[PDB]
Design a binder for this molecule. Sequence first.
Ligand SMILES: *Cc1cc2c(cc1C)nc1c(=O)[nH]c(=O)nc-1n2C[C@H](O)[C@H](O)[C@H](O)COP(=O)(O)OP(=O)(O)OC[C@H]1O[C@@H](n2cnc3c(N)ncnc32)[C@H](O)[C@@H]1O
Ligand SMILES: [Cl-]
Ligand code: NA
Length: 382
Amino acid sequence: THFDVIVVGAGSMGMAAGYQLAKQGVKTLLVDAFDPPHTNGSHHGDTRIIRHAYGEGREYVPLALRSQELWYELEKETHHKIFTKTGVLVFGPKGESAFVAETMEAAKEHSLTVDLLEGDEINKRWPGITVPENYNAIFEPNSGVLFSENCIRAYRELAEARGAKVLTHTRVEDFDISPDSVKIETANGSYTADKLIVSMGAWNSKLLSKLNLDIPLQPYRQVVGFFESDESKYSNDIDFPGFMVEVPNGIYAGFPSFGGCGLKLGYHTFGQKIDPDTINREFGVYPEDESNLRAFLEEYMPGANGELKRGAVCMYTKTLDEHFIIDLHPEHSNVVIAAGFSGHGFKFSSGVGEVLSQLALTGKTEHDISIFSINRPALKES
Ligand SMILES: *Cc1cc2c(cc1C)nc1c(=O)[nH]c(=O)nc-1n2C[C@H](O)[C@H](O)[C@H](O)COP(=O)(O)OP(=O)(O)OC[C@H]1O[C@@H](n2cnc3c(N)ncnc32)[C@H](O)[C@@H]1O
Ligand SMILES: [Cl-]
Ligand code: NA
């Protein structure tokens, strides 16, 4: 059967696209290598931060705010848990964090509700945090934490109820694009449609070449660990925040303990360069997996440095500028590309789904997506 739209990669971005398309009666096929949500891509490890005041650049704020509303809509539509409003704390040494400074500028430019704190005010407000006196902070009370695997699962179940079809455990191997249709090849058969969305996460870095694109898209191995913690300090129940912070040796991001699961941490600015089909997915096979996390905890969050309860291994896919790619294919207006989310895309996946549906159906979007152009110079090596 010929579909209206085919989505290749039914993960964070593709499943949201599928939901958006199905809700409008568009006959959609989604094809995934696995059965999402799963532990082989970029969406597992339970939780994701959503921030509105945005240290990567104030121009992300409108998409973050739209995405936040879309997450509240999803919460109301499903029985799965979507969002909890932890707030997000950002801190770093005063005068020495571009990330903190841009977060602060973004909040001012968009009139976001934030608290500004410094030094011992941080340690007093949130027992369990120990920063130096020369640190400053911005705290965003109304952002928080998404349950990412639940988000994809809910979008899948809602899309399928409206007639979207999901073909699981099926790798797309090649493409054939014509002026008025698209075709995909798999070991389980070939499929056609009017429009294609390409959203294969870390595998975009290997398979966009089949669409005559050569864009730097390096996959990275990124681990997270959950640690036995002082629940009187680090529980969501006592208002411990989500956080993303800059210190001299890089950026870390973490989560309060939910229901006793332990504080979760990741080192965001370091990971191993990998290939998505040979990555070692076991936490702890490199000493740095656990040691880089405890180096942070023992200094800044010392009561959250107990036994390792759980570890996960997940992938980032970076562009050279660490901004996303969301655009039509430059040679094929019936092909939409979502790639290069550079370790910070999940929070936008609801809004991106809307963008991708608009691009597929109309060739345009009401959102300003200029900074995500596939033709920008900053994507290309010298
Ligand atoms: C790994 C990670 C990411 C991350 C994070 C922490 C970790 C450890 N913390 C974040 C946070 O707190 N807040 C946030 O906003 N983002 C954060 N991220 C990044 C975010 O998770 C990613 O940017 C995002 O998940 C990327 O989504 P995308 O949709 O691009 O990738 P995916 O969910 O892995 O989905 C891709 C799908 O494609 C399928 N696939 C692959 N190859 C094929 C072929 N050949 N054919 C068909 N399907 C294919 C995959 O199976 C997958 O389902
Ligand atoms: Cl990513
Ligand atoms: Na984040």
